[PDB]
Ligand binder design. Structure first.
Ligand SMILES: [Cl-]
Length: 280
């Protein structure tokens, strides 16, 4: 793909590699696009909690901030190939920009309804100062999605033992990627298997939402799909790509809860985003 938005004024279009940029801890999908006309750029990070008689809390702040044009030789950086190819599809009045992906800011997250979440945007604008007013005509804004792809780190095999009758319950796979299924060897009337998402908002009001993803009621072994076609989301609900919002490293986490009629057992496991084939 190519990710393009033009301005309401028309006088500048911005192009982006893709829309979802993943932090890998040791390196990250930085932002290497091209601008076409001074001209400035930044990344807004939005924190919203509630909508406009409870509690509205909106907080925006600019994290990277940049003169794009003319390219100051300090911010000058290696041109990506996509940048290299785009700069040939268009004129010499096309300028390549780059932003370091902003790690040590929180992953995109969007709790549906207290509505709540974190958002990201690339914004490039004309001005005669970096802290001058950012109007709507000379601005462009493209929503991006910033996510954390943290794989390395084992301590594998979820399992919880307990004994009033003894109950050892192991789980297939220690981390699971969005889309994957869950198996649960309950090697001990009823059995209740529950995947709960915890989301702890700390956006002013400090709230803890516990939320039931999937469940069955019926040595034995049972299966569950910790997916969304079956809540903290990695995205806005209008995007059919939006999935469940993946264990933080808003704080999201997951846990299995086995109740047998009463013996009781709650077992953690990490949830990573949906495995890709476009790493670096
Ligand atoms: Cl989104």
């Amino acid at each position: 793909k190519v990710y393009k938005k033009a301005s309401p004024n028309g006088k500048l279009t911005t192009y982006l590699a893709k829309r979802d940029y993943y932090d890998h801890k040791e390196w990250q999908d930085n932002i290497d696009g091209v601008c076409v006309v001074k001209v400035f750029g930044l990344i807004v990070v939005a924190f919203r909690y509630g909508r406009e008689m409870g509690v509205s809390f909106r907080k925006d702040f600019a994290v990277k901030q940049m003169q794009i044009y003319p390219p100051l030789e300090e911010n000058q950086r290696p041109l990506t190939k996509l940048q290299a190819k785009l700069l040939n599809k268009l004129g010499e009045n096309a300028v390549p920009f780059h932003y370091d992906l902003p790690t040590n800011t929180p992953d995109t997250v969007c709790i549906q309804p207290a509505p709540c979440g974190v958002d990201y945007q690339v914004t490039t604008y004309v001005s005669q100062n970096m802290d001058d007013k950012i109007h709507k005509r000379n601005s462009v804004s493209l929503s991006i999605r910033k996510l954390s792809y943290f794989e390395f780190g084992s301590d594998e095999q979820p399992r919880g033992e307990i004994s009033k009758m003894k109950l050892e319950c192991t789980l297939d796979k220690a981390r699971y990627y969005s889309g994957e299924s869950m198996n649960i060897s309950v090697c001990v009337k009823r059995i209740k298997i529950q995947i709960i998402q915890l989301a702890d908002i700390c956006l002013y009001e400090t709230v803890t939402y516990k939320s039931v993803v999937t469940e069955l009621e019926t040595c034995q072994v049972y299966k569950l799909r910790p997916v969304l076609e079956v809540l903290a989301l990695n995205g806005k609900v209008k995007y059919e790509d939006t999935m469940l919002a993946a264990s933080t490293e808003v704080v999201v986490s997951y846990k299995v809860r086995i109740k047998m009629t009463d013996m009781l057992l709650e077992v953690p496991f990490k949830l990573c985003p949906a495995r890709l084939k476009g790493r670096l």
